[PDB]
């Protein structure tokens, strides 16, 4: 059980970085789905 | 989140272009037979030929 040792590291080493609280989307995919909406 | 939000402008289309129908209805002349006559013809007999036609 909690092998806690998943093959996804391969994005914490530089493709992305430790405690940055960055977003879920895109600015522009909010501002589409807003438009998409009138 | 309402319907109203996303018709705005076919509405706009609509009501624009029975504007235009409405306006054509009365506007347009409903007379035929644009008749003309020639350069010499005597109205006092020019007007023979209105009565007659």
């Given at each position: 059980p909690a092998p806690s040792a998943n093959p996804a590291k391969i994005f914490i080493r530089r493709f992305f970085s430790a405690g940055?609280?960055?977003?879920?989307?895109s600015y522009s995919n909010v501002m589409a789905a807003q438009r998409a909406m009138e | 989140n309402t319907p109203l939000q996303a018709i705005g402008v076919p509405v706009a289309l609509y009501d624009a272009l029975m504007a235009r129908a409405i306006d054509s209805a009365d506007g347009t002349?409903?007379?035929?037979?644009?008749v003309t006559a020639s350069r010499d013809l005597d109205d006092g007999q020019a007007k023979e030929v209105k009565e007659g036609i």
């Open positions: 940055v609280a960055k977003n879920v989307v | 002349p409903n007379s035929k037979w644009l």
